[PDB]
Amino acid sequence: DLEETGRVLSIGDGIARVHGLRNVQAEEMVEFSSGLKGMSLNLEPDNVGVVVFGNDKLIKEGDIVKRTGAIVDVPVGEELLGRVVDALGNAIDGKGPIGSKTRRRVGLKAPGIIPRISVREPMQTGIKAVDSLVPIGRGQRELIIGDRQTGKTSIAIDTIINQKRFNDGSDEKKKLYCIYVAIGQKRSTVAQLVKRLTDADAMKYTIVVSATASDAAPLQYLAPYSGCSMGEYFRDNGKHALIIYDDLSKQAVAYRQMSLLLRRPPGREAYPGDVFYLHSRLLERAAKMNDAFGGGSLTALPVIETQAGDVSAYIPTNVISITDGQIFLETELFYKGIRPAINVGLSVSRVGSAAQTRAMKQVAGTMKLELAQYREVAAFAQFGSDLDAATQQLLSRGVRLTELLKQGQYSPMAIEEQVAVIYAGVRGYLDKLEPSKITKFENAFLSHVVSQHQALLGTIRADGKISEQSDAKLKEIVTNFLAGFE
Amino acid sequence: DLEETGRVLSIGDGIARVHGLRNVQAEEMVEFSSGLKGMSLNLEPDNVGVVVFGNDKLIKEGDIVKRTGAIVDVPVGEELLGRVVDALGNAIDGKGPIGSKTRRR
Amino acid sequence: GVGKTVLIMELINNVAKAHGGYSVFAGVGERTREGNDLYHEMIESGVINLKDATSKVALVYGQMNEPPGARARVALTGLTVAEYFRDQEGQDVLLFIDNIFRFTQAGSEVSALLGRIPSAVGYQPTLATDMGTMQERITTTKKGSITSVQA
Amino acid sequence: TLKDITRRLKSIKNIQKITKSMKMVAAAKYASEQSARMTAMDNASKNASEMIDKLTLTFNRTRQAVITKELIEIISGAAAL
Amino acid sequence: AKLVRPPVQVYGIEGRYATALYSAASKQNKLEQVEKELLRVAQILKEPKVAASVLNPYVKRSIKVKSLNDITAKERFSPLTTNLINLLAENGRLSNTQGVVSAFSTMMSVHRGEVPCTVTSASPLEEATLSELKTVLKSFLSQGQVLKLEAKTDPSILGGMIVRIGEKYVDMSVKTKIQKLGRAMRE
Ligand SMILES: Nc1ncnc2c1ncn2[C@@H]1O[C@H](COP(=O)(O)OP(=O)(O)OP(=O)(O)O)[C@@H](O)[C@H]1O
Ligand SMILES: [Mg+2]
Ligand SMILES: [Mg+2]
């Protein structure tokens, strides 16, 4: 048991200079005496700049640093589902060791051009606005960008919770395993998140990689790659995963500190010259494979916390350039009553229509067009009584739809119920109801339809379209209920 | 000597890199051989960085810098009333001296 | 203008009466005039007794005329004084920090003196070498609860 | 200044869309004075729009200047070692 | 001009001058000569007289290099050593000389195959086991080597032994044993 070693010329701030290690590799995992691990990032003629995955209080000068012989890798497998791990896979939920048998590198290359196919199958989140106007697909990278405290974590939690109906269900091809990388968040909030995901029986299929604020900068830098490898396992072995980095701005901040302490030349905003490389090699691994490779998938939902809508900053601009769209949340919508405060005009999906079932497409084309017609004139409100009647109907129907887009927390709606309520909203049935009652309506009406009309929803879900048969049945149910609603 | 006196290694732009002066304290006022005083701000392992309280023309590489033991100090009291003084408490209103019996750091 | 120190003193006294918890007031990088005003207003409001042992608050003051290192580490001093109460007596302590702005600008000055990190990164509330490792100590342990009120 | 430029540009955007609303309202009430109000508010909106374009040019110039200045600060602080 | 690099490298100005002299000596076959004369000139430059004179920052560069050339030329130096001295001098790198010499010494410590290895244990050993241990850790070596044992004693490891041979490192001490025991019984 002889290992090639080195001494510590200096330690601190997560950065250890190591004399020796004349055979260490770049991005290799070294192992100290205190049990701490680390990654050798800088290889210089006289020493090695190592980043430590822990606290620098357990290392002093002259401390022995052993090799391990392996690129930094983390254990993957189905043995992770339900656990809370740190950036290196070590379980911090206190429920015994991870019984995984295989490991995967954190810095693997993304699939090329050939193993990919177009994004076609939907990734249902359960938020009416997201699933209708800003759809997501399986194999897409849909950024979630916004200010602080606007409901990004909440949209990620709703998307994770919603896949319960498909996971407990019988279909093996519509099961989606979730992964929630937490970067720079308080441990208390991660505890709230895990208790919320176990109250909804969602932890049965979710992994959590937590690199909190008190965790060393190398751990917050590594966490997204460990999570993406855990997801790439499913993606390459035929299953369908989904990964949420909450958030990427703080992983960028951790990388910035690391690079500044490794004496690397700063760039714009002091970020290193290759932070675009960082985020793009992280995000391009979220692919959608073909049937010759397994048909797997890996949806990424990177999160970005801007400062006062500043999407023209460095890191927001990079992540917007890399992703396949965005979901822009606002504090003005978050105060003016819209929750989820999704901004429909700024948000976009570059795949979009390809990632919807036919029913949601049928209703969402009309909804999105009418909402555009509402926003192009929305400033004309507060004097609507003094303008054209068709534009007044546009304004009224727009308010109707916008309040049809509000939704409570931790209640992700099924797709057929979504298309049902959006149908009852866009066909004019609410131009008679005033806006202050649309929530009462939606609630009571949806309860009525799910209780008394289960067969209709079953057929709409088994077909995915609103056939003229089911269209007539929707006419029936909407008109009969509305006739009786107070 | 090289414990209570040093020798200017370099001079320029009002900064004198002084060699020696081992026993000098920080922010202490040393005196160059040309009569100009300076404040030792940088205490470096190899030299001292002295900011010169005047014109760096009168200071040459190799000059002798002597410790005085006096950190900066200005006169105070009611006698200073009505007099225009400079940054170090010397009268510049051309009205004689100032009968200040009290000083203060 | 609005009476704020009265609200702080009321919170202190109420948490000390309703519950059995004490309070720590950190005065990180703050005007000594305001600090003396608060100290006196607390003395004559019963929160502090100079002739007893029934005072309901411990004070930690780092003034603005002190080096950046002082005004940066003076937030951790009050934090530790409250950490003792929490993790040693199970109380629900109430820790005040007069400004996080002062603390983060002091940390920015500290890192500017060491000239190792450009002065465009300041103190990062998420990095554990700056404010994060401090802000996470203020949580609800399963032995107690620190809570931080920040003007 | 970037923030003061945003302040003035938001002021002009405010009054621009205000005159837009008032123009379309006075065009509704057009079914003499109302037609004059319509055309006057149209001209006011076009004036405010050209001012918005001027302010956008100035804003882009100031944004480039700010980015360059912060880069110079960073590199001159790093190059002193 | 092609250079012949030593098997181990030293860096900084120290290592640069050391490898310059190493190549300048291996190109005309005077390693041993320049080595012993280097250690002796290091002894000469550390005598308090010239040891004090040599760092005084105002002594003129030309006058000081000629003074040092005078003082070194009397020991019957070969041209390579006085060339190194005059280069370090007119380049103002005299205060580094001994360090360079040290480097050069360690340079030769690899040319003769001298492998430094430490065998540290709880308490000092008796040289019967130490000799059989010399045999044991000389066993792993390749063709044509000589070894240098520097054993130190520390009771903080409370037993066992640590063999740090070059970069290879076995920790058979009971400290690492009990730490492994604890980390395993907790996990
Ligand atoms: N759809 C919603 N409807 C009503 N309230 C909501 C909704 N989503 C979130 N909230 C509430 O708004 C608050 C903030 O939401 P959330 O934490 O998800 O945003 P965030 O930006 O991710 O937070 P942070 O800035 O700390 O990362 C929460 O208390 C949450 O309860
Ligand atoms: Mg959040
Ligand atoms: Mg504040």
Side-chain angles (χ1 to χ4, degrees):
Chain A
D1 55 356
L2 73 163
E3 311 90 21
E4 319 179 10
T5 181
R7 290 185 301 108
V8 170
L9 281 167
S10 68
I11 182 71
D13 316 297
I15 299 309
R17 294 285 179 199
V18 174
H19 168 93
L21 283 183
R22 305 320 275 159
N23 291 260
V24 75
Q25 320 167 5
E27 294 193 50
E28 179 179 358
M29 186 176 281
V30 304
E31 213 271 337
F32 287 68
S33 61
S34 297
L36 280 186
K37 328 265 187 186
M39 188 167 67
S40 67
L41 268 186
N42 270 25
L43 303 192
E44 305 183 33
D46 47 350
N47 59 66
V48 172
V50 170
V51 303
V52 296
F53 298 135
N55 48 304
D56 68 83
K57 281 85 166 175
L58 310 192
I59 299 94
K60 271 74 71 176
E61 306 279 325
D63 205 58
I64 295 299
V65 170
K66 277 79 69 178
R67 283 192 64 187
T68 76
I71 312 294
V72 163
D73 52 355
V74 295
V76 300
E78 298 217 339
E79 303 82 331
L80 292 166
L81 307 154
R83 312 298 310 276
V84 188
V85 310
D86 59 347
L88 269 178
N90 306 321
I92 66 158
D93 49 359
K95 299 180 185 197
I98 302 297
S100 44
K101 276 77 69 178
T102 183
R103 318 181 63 75
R104 201 183 177 93
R105 292 186 188 181
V106 298
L108 288 177
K109 211 151 156 52
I113 287 288
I114 298 299
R116 306 213 183 200
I117 205 72
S118 179
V119 160
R120 50 202 59 198
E121 58 185 1
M123 199 277 306
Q124 307 294 346
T125 70
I127 302 100
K128 286 166 285 180
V130 165
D131 284 22
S132 177
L133 306 171
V134 190
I136 317 181
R138 298 203 176 189
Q140 190 183 301
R141 307 147 274 161
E142 172 86 24
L143 172 74
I144 300 160
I145 187 160
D147 212 326
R148 48 177 169 77
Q149 287 142 352
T150 43
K152 299 181 299 304
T153 318
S154 300
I155 293 190
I157 290 315
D158 294 332
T159 300
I160 289 159
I161 280 171
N162 194 9
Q163 330 295 331
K164 188 191 188 321
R165 45 178 39 86
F166 307 102
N167 275 323
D168 286 356
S170 64
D171 194 86
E172 201 270 357
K173 211 77 81 168
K174 295 173 197 281
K175 281 171 182 168
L176 185 76
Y177 306 89
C178 286
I179 295 160
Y180 183 85
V181 193
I183 316 151
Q185 300 173 354
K186 307 176 300 191
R187 274 181 182 95
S188 75
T189 297
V190 188
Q192 319 312 310
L193 193 138
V194 181
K195 63 93 181 175
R196 185 65 70 189
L197 284 186
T198 191
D199 278 332
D201 212 295
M203 282 299 307
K204 185 256 298 177
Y205 55 88
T206 307
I207 320 178
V208 175
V209 187
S210 90
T212 60
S214 45
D215 287 315
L219 282 171
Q220 318 178 29
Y221 153 75
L222 201 64
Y225 294 100
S226 291
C228 170
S229 294
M230 297 176 179
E232 198 166 6
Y233 161 70
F234 306 124
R235 185 211 71 204
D236 280 90
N237 283 307
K239 315 189 183 316
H240 299 231
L242 155 71
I243 185 164
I244 295 100
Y245 320 102
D246 193 320
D247 56 358
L248 281 196
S249 43
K250 287 154 180 72
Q251 188 264 330
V253 167
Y255 190 42
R256 157 162 80 180
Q257 173 202 356
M258 289 172 66
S259 297
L260 287 176
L261 302 183
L262 289 170
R263 280 304 162 90
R264 289 180 181 190
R268 180 169 158 187
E269 263 178 34
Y271 291 104
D274 56 3
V275 70
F276 187 95
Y277 186 36
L278 177 88
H279 278 153
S280 68
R281 76 175 150 179
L282 169 62
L283 285 179
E284 284 282 84
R285 302 159 71 173
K288 168 72 174 70
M289 314 289 272
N290 53 1
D291 293 332
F293 272 72
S297 175
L298 173 52
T299 295
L301 296 195
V303 185
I304 292 296
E305 174 178 357
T306 68
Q307 289 82 17
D310 214 3
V311 305
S312 296
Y314 194 33
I315 292 307
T317 301
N318 287 20
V319 189
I320 287 169
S321 177
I322 305 170
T323 47
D324 270 319
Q326 75 179 74
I327 290 174
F328 194 95
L329 299 168
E330 287 211 292
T331 64
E332 308 86 328
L333 305 190
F334 196 79
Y335 264 122
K336 76 182 278 294
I338 309 189
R339 281 163 322 284
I342 291 157
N343 191 302
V344 178
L346 307 176
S347 308
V348 75
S349 306
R350 293 182 186 271
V351 176
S353 70
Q356 279 176 325
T357 59
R358 191 45 192 191
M360 182 52 80
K361 202 175 309 176
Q362 292 171 53
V363 76
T366 302
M367 183 177 194
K368 184 175 175 66
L369 186 157
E370 291 190 39
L371 270 163
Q373 292 179 163
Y374 163 66
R375 285 189 326 263
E376 68 182 74
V377 301
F380 302 158
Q382 309 310 327
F383 320 105
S385 297
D386 285 291
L387 54 91
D388 179 69
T391 54
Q392 289 190 78
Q393 204 275 349
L394 278 198
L395 279 195
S396 178
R397 182 85 88 82
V399 180
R400 264 50 167 199
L401 298 198
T402 59
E403 288 205 19
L404 208 74
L405 282 182
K406 302 179 180 190
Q407 183 175 0
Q409 201 157 347
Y410 317 122
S411 51
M413 290 179 39
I415 175 65
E416 59 268 38
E417 314 168 27
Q418 285 193 88
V419 70
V421 55
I422 303 277
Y423 184 102
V426 300
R427 290 306 168 80
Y429 289 103
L430 298 166
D431 194 48
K432 300 287 98 176
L433 186 58
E434 51 94 13
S436 297
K437 196 164 272 153
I438 305 294
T439 180
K440 291 169 68 177
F441 179 76
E442 180 190 339
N443 284 347
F445 171 85
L446 182 49
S447 182
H448 162 62
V449 185
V450 63
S451 65
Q452 277 102 18
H453 303 291
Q454 274 290 99
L456 173 80
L457 303 189
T459 70
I460 296 171
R461 192 188 57 242
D463 308 343
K465 50 172 169 166
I466 296 182
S467 64
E468 291 295 327
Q469 299 73 14
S470 295
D471 201 349
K473 278 188 275 293
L474 266 180
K475 300 289 185 183
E476 184 193 350
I477 298 166
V478 175
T479 197
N480 308 319
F481 180 90
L482 191 149
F485 179 83
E486 301 296 338
Chain B
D1 196 1
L2 295 195
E3 288 88 7
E4 298 272 69
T5 191
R7 184 195 52 80
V8 171
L9 271 189
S10 166
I11 185 66
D13 287 309
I15 301 296
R17 304 300 210 178
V18 164
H19 161 74
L21 267 190
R22 290 308 308 186
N23 271 354
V24 74
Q25 313 169 339
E27 297 195 1
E28 187 194 358
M29 166 165 278
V30 308
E31 178 188 316
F32 295 87
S33 67
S34 297
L36 286 179
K37 301 181 165 294
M39 216 169 62
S40 60
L41 281 188
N42 266 23
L43 296 185
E44 280 211 5
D46 199 303
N47 46 69
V48 180
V50 179
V51 294
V52 189
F53 277 98
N55 197 38
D56 57 358
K57 157 169 52 56
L58 311 157
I59 289 165
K60 295 157 67 176
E61 187 269 331
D63 285 335
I64 293 282
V65 196
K66 272 174 313 172
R67 269 200 49 188
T68 59
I71 304 187
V72 191
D73 177 11
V74 303
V76 301
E78 264 202 348
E79 300 102 10
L80 267 186
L81 291 173
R83 314 282 303 271
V84 185
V85 309
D86 72 324
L88 284 171
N90 312 288
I92 67 173
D93 59 335
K95 305 196 184 178
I98 41 177
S100 82
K101 301 298 289 189
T102 306
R103 305 193 67 75
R104 204 205 155 90
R105 278 196 161 176
Chain C
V2 175
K4 203 212 272 190
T5 52
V6 175
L7 176 60
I8 312 176
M9 286 185 301
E10 175 63 18
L11 267 175
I12 281 165
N13 193 11
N14 277 359
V15 168
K17 280 169 64 184
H19 319 297
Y22 297 127
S23 297
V24 180
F25 183 87
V28 52
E30 276 300 305
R31 317 180 172 74
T32 73
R33 184 192 63 77
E34 265 168 359
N36 191 1
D37 270 340
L38 183 68
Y39 178 59
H40 280 321
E41 183 69 12
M42 284 191 310
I43 283 186
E44 286 98 14
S45 166
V47 166
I48 304 190
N49 287 319
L50 302 198
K51 305 207 289 293
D52 287 328
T54 182
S55 49
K56 277 82 73 176
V57 78
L59 289 163
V60 174
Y61 271 128
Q63 315 162 14
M64 275 195 316
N65 69 328
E66 290 174 350
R71 299 178 290 107
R73 302 293 195 255
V74 70
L76 310 175
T77 292
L79 181 53
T80 290
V81 181
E83 280 261 355
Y84 163 88
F85 292 137
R86 178 196 73 187
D87 303 342
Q88 194 77 244
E89 283 151 50
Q91 311 193 346
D92 302 333
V93 285
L94 188 62
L95 162 76
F96 305 92
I97 310 185
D98 201 271
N99 268 314
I100 293 310
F101 172 88
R102 302 287 188 188
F103 170 44
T104 178
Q105 89 172 354
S108 298
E109 298 161 42
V110 160
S111 296
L113 296 168
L114 300 196
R116 193 192 327 179
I117 305 293
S119 185
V121 185
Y123 249 12
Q124 290 298 120
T126 72
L127 272 28
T129 58
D130 299 358
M131 284 179 320
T133 185
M134 177 273 295
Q135 294 285 359
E136 204 279 333
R137 280 211 278 171
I138 302 170
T139 53
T140 46
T141 306
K142 70 180 200 295
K143 291 176 69 68
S145 176
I146 307 189
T147 174
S148 54
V149 182
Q150 324 167 341
Chain D
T1 308
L2 212 66
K3 269 68 69 177
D4 308 336
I5 279 174
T6 59
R7 274 193 229 263
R8 184 161 146 83
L9 195 149
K10 288 188 284 185
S11 176
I12 279 182
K13 274 177 162 188
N14 189 1
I15 80 173
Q16 194 270 346
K17 71 100 173 181
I18 279 177
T19 72
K20 288 172 67 172
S21 177
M22 192 150 70
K23 158 188 168 65
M24 66 86 66
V25 158
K29 278 194 172 207
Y30 190 52
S32 160
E33 156 183 353
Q34 312 297 329
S35 178
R37 180 155 294 130
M38 189 192 82
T39 71
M41 292 305 110
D42 201 301
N43 295 25
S45 287
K46 85 173 175 68
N47 283 330
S49 67
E50 84 160 354
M51 294 198 77
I52 278 170
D53 291 330
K54 270 197 210 67
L55 278 182
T56 285
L57 280 192
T58 301
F59 170 82
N60 283 343
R61 188 178 299 114
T62 295
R63 182 198 54 102
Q64 303 188 18
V66 166
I67 305 176
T68 299
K69 155 183 176 170
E70 304 186 2
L71 282 174
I72 290 174
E73 280 172 18
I74 281 149
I75 64 175
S76 294
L81 309 172
Chain E
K2 193 161 184 295
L3 296 174
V4 48
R5 298 142 182 74
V8 300
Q9 296 178 358
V10 185
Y11 307 84
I13 57 172
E14 304 291 330
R16 172 54 188 172
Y17 275 88
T19 184
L21 180 57
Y22 172 90
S23 66
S26 45
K27 279 162 182 176
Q28 210 269 328
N29 297 113
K30 303 164 60 170
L31 275 301
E32 318 88 30
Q33 294 177 356
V34 303
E35 169 189 16
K36 310 169 212 95
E37 263 73 350
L38 268 190
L39 66 87
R40 189 45 195 167
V41 76
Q43 300 280 51
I44 292 173
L45 270 297
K46 74 171 67 183
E47 65 199 1
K49 300 178 290 295
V50 65
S53 85
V54 69
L55 77 159
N56 197 17
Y58 199 25
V59 192
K60 314 172 184 294
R61 188 158 281 169
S62 297
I63 302 312
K64 185 65 178 68
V65 62
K66 267 68 180 174
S67 176
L68 183 55
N69 195 358
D70 294 331
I71 297 285
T72 59
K74 68 177 71 177
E75 196 193 354
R76 312 137 193 81
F77 272 146
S78 78
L80 286 191
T81 310
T82 185
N83 276 306
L84 172 72
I85 297 299
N86 295 348
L87 191 52
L88 287 156
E90 68 183 1
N91 190 207
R93 303 281 147 162
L94 289 174
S95 178
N96 308 133
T97 311
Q98 183 177 2
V100 167
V101 176
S102 180
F104 201 92
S105 68
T106 59
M107 283 274 189
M108 295 335 275
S109 185
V110 177
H111 203 268
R112 287 159 305 177
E114 286 211 338
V115 169
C117 84
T118 305
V119 53
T120 184
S121 190
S123 280
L125 277 301
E126 49 90 19
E127 210 176 5
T129 60
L130 192 139
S131 198
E132 205 280 332
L133 181 146
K134 157 70 173 174
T135 306
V136 161
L137 50 76
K138 171 171 59 67
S139 297
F140 282 143
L141 267 297
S142 293
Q143 267 267 327
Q145 270 83 10
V146 63
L147 186 134
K148 293 281 98 177
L149 274 168
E150 310 114 328
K152 197 52 67 175
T153 79
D154 266 344
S156 65
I157 72 166
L158 72 155
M161 57 181 69
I162 307 296
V163 170
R164 166 94 181 289
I165 172 165
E167 277 200 353
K168 310 300 198 142
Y169 179 86
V170 296
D171 51 356
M172 302 170 267
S173 58
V174 308
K175 174 60 69 68
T176 303
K177 296 286 98 176
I178 62 171
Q179 286 188 55
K180 175 174 194 283
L181 297 191
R183 297 213 305 266
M185 187 61 72
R186 302 186 153 120
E187 294 178 353

